[model samples]
Target: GSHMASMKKKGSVVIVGRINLSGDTAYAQQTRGEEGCQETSQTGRDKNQVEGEVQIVSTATQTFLATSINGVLWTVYHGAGTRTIASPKGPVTQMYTNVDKDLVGWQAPQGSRSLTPCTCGSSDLYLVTRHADVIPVRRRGDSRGSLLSPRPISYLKGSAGGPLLCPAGHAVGIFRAAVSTRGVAKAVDFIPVESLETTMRS
Candidate 1:
């Protein structure tokens, strides 16, 4: 009930689809704003995924953004999908870039609350994917070692490349991969939201 007014379940998350030459479709996520659409480089990596073109569709509105073929950026953690269609922009979500050497994450859908990493405890974190799946997860018990860390959330078939939002609706990290210990799986690895700036020339 407290501070729930600003929390949004489907504000900025979008679907990044790659149309192959065979007319097949694949999708992913990024934040929409006035500047442009922001997303990770997960979709364009596979030569087959982008053989035709990329489409950025809004998850909330289902409005297809007029993405340019030459406007896609393949950066380290994040990149821009420039739109030139001159139409109404989607929701402008805020991103949290101040990550530390701690296990900080977020929940989603119903409500969001920022978990304190220095408290010597972990909470439930959700992996919101393009398929609209709100996965319940927790950060592995460890400090920040690398830009990418494995999460305790199980690998759900197709749940890669999306943002981990905080209670205040700020994006914390981008989903990278699913991992596991011994031989089982379901856990995930993700890059910190701050890593998006690594590509900035400034």
Candidate 2:
């Protein structure tokens, strides 16, 4: 994985799937990513009976990334949570505010390699949250887990759209939702490793 060395430059990453807010509809970008994507005749295996994990596509998450920014680019993706762009005043310096034509879309916990990340009914786990920081968590039940986000941090925060990693470094689920009541918290649900497996295509 020495190639990882070459890809060390830091940029920015954002979740970009169909996030249907209260009164707003989902915005499907027809940018370069969907340039020549077309539908053709289907001639393959009719794999029926979709289970929890192997169904394919969560329809809950979207991915986008941009990097080499100036000032604090987080506002570019967070806060308003809008699509961004990357233009330039000159050549060396680029500008982006809800725009980046060179933008690329991706899915985390992707590929068949990281499939089946959790096995035990419950195991101590951790999550990769904002700033690529690893915060502690636990898998309790269908949507139950513990938030071990350091001290003074009563419950788990961050990692809205990240992966839950087991002790073995295997991904057990995609960090999706977290619920809270009172001043503390309620439940945290990951998409589950199996459910995410079927989503990956060959």
Candidate 3:
């Protein structure tokens, strides 16, 4: 399968506040561009009325050293009892050790579960986002995980997370944000998956 196909099959999670009431859907909305990404929700009655922004603790590569939904549930819960949804896969039913900066590893009883891990920085790369947006991007300048997109890529407000995949469908890095230091924002910053390799092996 292609990298998109491989990742789509492995799927991604959408983190939502676990309210007692049913039929209410939580959404992560970007209120302002280049500010932050926040989680909001709407009831079945008023689907357009987005209310409250849940705190996002962190956003990491989906291929864990851990995991979450839409965006990785890096920081929502203040405590263990705080309810959050790791939809399609359920909650963080199991816990594991936090390897490196943003990577996590699955503990016992639960294996990799069919995730295909790949090295970072391939010659041909593409950013596959949660909203089904796939745009070709290449590494720019230095080797510190900077990306340059040729065409216009829709960056959802800001802090949109996606996989920087190779031609063979192996993920090389994660799209952190679309950075605009100069006028037009064509360059992006990402977390290279390769950074966690040493820690994971240790």
Candidate 4:
């Protein structure tokens, strides 16, 4: 039987608070366009500069919406003004979601040995889904007729460039590249938006 492989990545954003919430307030942040790319690479040395603004919207509601750039979460908000979140890095993809809680869920593919998601912090908290696919590739022998057998590919880098969106134009998760295969890559995975909702139970 063919086995499925999974991989995971982590990223984050920073939020400058104007009026801090006294108790519990609903908030949304998002990293969008070229600016979103730069913010995703905040952990790296050289930050990627962008031409746009980072917005944060808050209310007394419970639901929050955000976007993920290169695996980092950016709280989506209304209005305009470029706010530095994080530095952008590498070939990454973006994911968007409407969440009511902080915890997000990602599923791993079959035959996966281990899955790890990366994360960072700022005024607003950021996290990645815990599941990924485990893709398998077969090796080939050049001279000899012997088969090289199948081996698990790991550490496939995801794309940072994205205009990630859902079929209904609701902006879901970003499109990530398979971490194993480089030249002949197979599967493309996505992170859902609902996974980032905050879970502060009363």
Candidate 5:
């Protein structure tokens, strides 16, 4: 999952980045890659310095997306072979690869709000979105066999980095924009809740 990321803190919510929506893939091994990494770098919150007694928020390691649901902010991980962040917690290694999963994040303190997709594709499968101008999608494979299955949605460039919500604002995943060989823009992908427990542990 070799890639790049940018992060920022607003009030108490630290908005972070996600790997390309295609979770994982390898002939005999791999978890993901496709976010168009370019030896990236990030700025800070206040668009500024670090913090204390704060959370590590979202980050990735080659092993998985790292963050805690209820644990202390002991560390931050990033970069290709689990390579990668901002803030007082600081970041660790960054090589990236062989990673996998859906939405990758940490748990908030008790009484914190929650984002969940109660039911998806139960009927028409139409989503109720609060995250945007309602981009509907269907997850499927591609001819290249990239192993990146995305729920197709129209292009909304700046929207890819936000939440892909279902009916009534139930967040199902994070949206990712797709680019075609002809340079045409296609559907947008997202990180669903199916893998929440696993990624949140990191």
Candidate 6:
């Protein structure tokens, strides 16, 4: 069966663990690179459920973990563990910076018709679309929590230069250079996931 078909059939909940960069050093080192944004299993007998004691290396060595789900961010360190935090949501966007001047052409491994030359620049951008048409839910006063946003999968000159895949090994999208406002190819803009998935099937 196709990967997308399998994901759709399973309808399992995916959880994303985030370690704030401003926190303890241990958390920062553990969640560096792809591992930081990587998804972990929370189902089945072998699944590592998202409940555990998290230790923070600080002035006094603070210990905390998720006690309840609030919105997008999880609540931790709160005494009773009953405190809630924001739940994770998004079209996950990964931005790449600093392109090598000696490099040549760059392309998306997931297959995209859009490809262009890279101009010498300090930073490049890329994105990965996890969900489409994400609507932000607002409160009466003002939005306080982190709201989910849609970011389509894309590639830039500075990327590792290869295929991008989802946790389920689904080819959902690709990355490539972005065109200029004048319709000329200049830099890279990530192709949205919905569009990428659509292109992949066709």
Per-residue C-alpha lDDT of model 6 across residues 1-202, encoded as one tens digit per residue = 5568556211111223222222222131232122322321112111222321121111111222211111111111111122111123322221122132111111111111222222222121222212111122111111011113322223122221111223332222233333344443233333223332232332
Q: Give the TM-score of candidate 3.
A: 0.44
Worst 10 residues of 2 by lDDT: 35-44
lDDT of 4 at 169: 24
Which digits, one per residue and each the tens of the lDDT, describe model 4 over residues 1-202?
A: 5344654333333222111112243222232433433344344222322321112222222112223322344443221112223332332222333343212211111111221122221111111211122122221111111112222323223222111232222323323323335453343333333333221110
Q: TM-score for every candidate vs. truth?
A: 0.34, 0.39, 0.44, 0.25, 0.38, 0.18
- In the range 74-139, model 2's lDDT, one tens digit per residue, is 221232233222211111111323233111112222211223445664578865543344567877
Candidate 3 Cα errors over 4 Å, as ranges: 1-115, 119-121, 141-159
Question: Of models 5 and 6, which has the larger lDDT?
Answer: 5
So what's the TM-score on candidate 4?
Answer: 0.25
The local distance difference test score of model 5 is: 0.30
Error of 6 at 6 (Å): 11
> Per-residue CA lDDT of candidate 5, range 117-148, in tens?
43554211222221223335554431111113
Model 2 gets an lDDT of 0.36
Candidate 6 local Cα displacement, residue 192, angstroms = 28
Q: Write the per-residue lDDT of candidate 1 for residues 20-139, one digit (tens) a residue.
A: 212233344343342233322212111112222223343333333211111221111122122111112323222222223211111111111222212223334555554444455566
What overall lDDT goes with each candidate model?
0.34, 0.36, 0.35, 0.26, 0.30, 0.22
What are the per-model numbers of colliding residue pairs? Answer: 5, 16, 14, 44, 24, 17
Residue 92's C-alpha lDDT in candidate 5? 26
**What stretches of model 4 exceed 4 Å from their correct place?**
1-158, 161-163, 179-182, 198-202
